[PDB]
Amino acid sequence: GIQGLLQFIKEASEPIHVRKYKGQVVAVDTYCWLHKGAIACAEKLAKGEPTDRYVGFCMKFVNMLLSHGIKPILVFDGCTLPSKKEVERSRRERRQANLLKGKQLLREGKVSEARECFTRSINITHAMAHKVIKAARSQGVDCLVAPYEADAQLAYLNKAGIVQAIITEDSDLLAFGCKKVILKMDQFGNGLEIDQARLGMCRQLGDVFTEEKFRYMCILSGCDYLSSLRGIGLAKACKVLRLANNPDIVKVIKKIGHYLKMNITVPEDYINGFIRANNTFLYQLVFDPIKRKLIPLNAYEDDVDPETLSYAGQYVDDSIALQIALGNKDINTFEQIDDYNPDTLYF
DNA sequence: CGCTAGTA
DNA sequence: ACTAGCG
Ligand code: NA
C-alpha cells in the first residue's frame, strides 16, 4: 500500500479503545483478521486438511466488538481489478512454488524448515471467507462482499454515513477519503485512530491536508495502482505538492524535476498511470447496500467519461452484484454456492 | 544531512 | 524496524 503513510501523518493519530464507538456501527476490513487467523493454519491449509481456527480468530475479534455494544460490518474483497489482474497470478505462482518447496521439504523429513516453507504458501480463498460469513451470520453480524477491492467499499460505507469508523491494517483507506480509520487494533480494543479532520495537525504536511491533494500525494509517493518515480517518497511528494500552485496536476507532475531540484523526466506511461490511479481512487465501483445497486465510490464529475474507466471495475446487473454482495455467488465461477436472503444493513 | 529504498 | 547509499 502507501509506503509508510502512518509515520508521515503521526500527529493525526490518537490511541483509542473501541468502547468509544459503543452503540454505533463500524466497518471491518475482515482480511486483516482472516490472514492472521490463517497463519495458525499454515500447515493445515497447505496439507488440504480441514481446519476452523481462523474462524475462531475472526469471531474472537467480532465478539470482542459485540461486547462493547458495537454493530460490526464484515467487508471482504471481491473480484480483482484488471490492473492487479496479473500481479495476483504472480503471487499465485510464488504461492504454489513455495507450496512445492514446502511439500518437498516435508517429504525430505526435515519439517523444521517446513515452518518457513508451508507458511509462505498460505492463500485466503473465498470459501474461508464464506465460512467466516456463516459464523458471523450465526451471531447477527451483517456481512458485505465488495464488488472489487474492500478498501473502496469500506470508504463508501464511511463516506455515506452508514458506518462511523473503519477497522483495518491498511493505510490506503485514508487515500480513499475515509473520515475515521482505526489501526493497530488488538483483541481487546486498543488501537490507533486517525481522523481526516485531524490531518491538519501534521505540520510536515503543509497545506496538503485536503482530500484531493492528500490523494495526489499518496499516489505520487507510490501505491498499488502506480509505482513511484525513482527517489520519490512521501516527503518528496508532499514537498512538490506544497511547492505547487497550478491546479493542473499533470503540469505539476511534468514539472516534478523543477520543484525538487532533481534530474527526473516523466515517462509517458507514468502520466496515464497517475490519471488511472486517481480515477481508481475516485470512481472504483462499490455496492450500495441501501439502494441495492452498483455505484462508483464517488459520483462522476463533469470532466470524466465512465466508458474509459473499465480498469476501475466493470458493471454488472444489480441482482448479480447483490448475490455477490451477500456471498451467495462465487467470485470466479459465478456459481450459486449459497441462498441467503436479507429479507427472510440491507434495509 | 534529509530522504529513499532495500533488508529484517 | 535499521541503515547503507545518494542527491
Ligand atoms: Na516511493
Query: Whats the size of chain A, residue-wise?
Result: 347
Measured CA A7 to C1' C5 distance, in angstroms = 22
Residue intervals of chain A classified under CATH 3.40.50.1010 are 1-206
Contacts of A332 (CB under 8 A, 6+ apart): A126
Q: What is the CA radius of gyration of chain A?
A: 21
Amino acid at residue number A213: K
Which positions in strand B are less than 7 Å from the protein's CB atoms? 2-5
Q: Transcribe A189-228 into DSSP letters.
A: S-EEEEESGGGGG-GGGTTTTSHHHHHHHHHHH--SSSPP
CB count in 10 Å sphere of residue A151 = 28
Measured CA A5 to C1' B4 distance, in angstroms = 14
Q: In the CATH scheme, what is the homologous superfamily, with its name and number, of domain A1-206?
A: 5'-nuclease (3.40.50.1010)
How far away, in angstroms, is A88 Cα from ligand 1 center? Answer: 21
The whole-angstrom separation of Cα A157 and Cα A54 is 25
**Is the CB atom of residue A3 positioned under 7 angstroms from any atom of strand B?**
yes
Q: Which residue is nearest to nucleotide C6 (CA to C1')?
A: A231
CATH of A207-284, one of 1.10.150.20, 2.60.40.1170, 1.10.10.10, 3.40.50.280: 1.10.150.20
Q: Which residues pair with A28 in a beta bridge?
A: A74, A167
C1'-nearest nucleotide to the CA of A6 = C1
How far away, in angstroms, is A258 Cα from ligand 1 center? Answer: 18
How far away, in angstroms, is A217 Cα from ligand 1 center? Answer: 11
The whole-angstrom separation of Cα A84 and Cα A224 is 8
Q: Which residue is nearest to nucleotide B3 (CA to C1')?
A: A235
The whole-angstrom separation of Cα A281 and Cα A212 is 10
The whole-angstrom separation of Cα A174 and Cα A92 is 28
3-state helix, strand and coil shares in percent for chain A, rounded to the nearest 5: 50, 10, 40
Measured CA A16 to C1' C3 distance, in angstroms = 32
Measured CA A286 to C1' B4 distance, in angstroms = 35
Q: Which residues pair with A76 in a beta bridge?
A: A145
Q: Transcribe A22-82 into DSSP letters.
A: TTSEEEEETHHHHHHHHHTTHHHHHHT----HHHHHHHHHHHHHHHTT-EEEEEE--SPPT
Provide the b/e sequence for A287-319 (b: ≥16 CB within 10 Å): bbbeeeebbbbbeeeeeeeeeebebbbeeeebe
**Is the CB atom of residue A228 positioned under 7 angstroms from any atom of strand B?**
yes
Report DSSP state, residue A17.
-
How far away, in angstroms, is A9 Cα from ligand 1 center? Answer: 16
**Is the CB atom of residue A231 positioned under 7 angstroms from any atom of strand B?**
yes
How many helical (H) and strand (E) elements, i.e. helices and strands, does chain A have? 15, 9
Using left for φ > 0, alpha for ψ between -120 and 50, and beta otherwise, residue A181 falls in beta
Walk across the sheet containing A191-195 and list its strands.
A13-16, A191-195, A180-183, A165-167, A25-29, A71-76, A143-145
Nearest to A278 by CA among A331, A341, A213, A336: A213
Beta strands in chain A (DSSP E): 13-16, 25-29, 71-76, 143-145, 165-167, 180-183, 191-195, 285-288, 293-296
The whole-angstrom separation of Cα A120 and Cα A103 is 12
Residue intervals of chain A classified under CATH 1.10.150.20 are 207-284
* Technique used: X-ray
Half-sphere exposure of A22 (CA within 13 A, CB side): 8
Q: Which residues fall inside 5 Å of ion ligand 1, going by CB?
A: A 222, 228, 233
Q: Which residues touch strand C (CB under 7 A)?
A: A 7, 231, 261-262
How far away, in angstroms, is A229 Cα from ligand 1 center? Answer: 7
Q: At what angle do helices A211-221 and A234-243 cross, to 10 degrees?
A: 140
A77 in a known ligand binding site? yes
In three-state secondary structure terms, A181 is: strand
How far away, in angstroms, is A235 Cα from ligand 1 center? Answer: 9
In three-state secondary structure terms, A118 is: helix
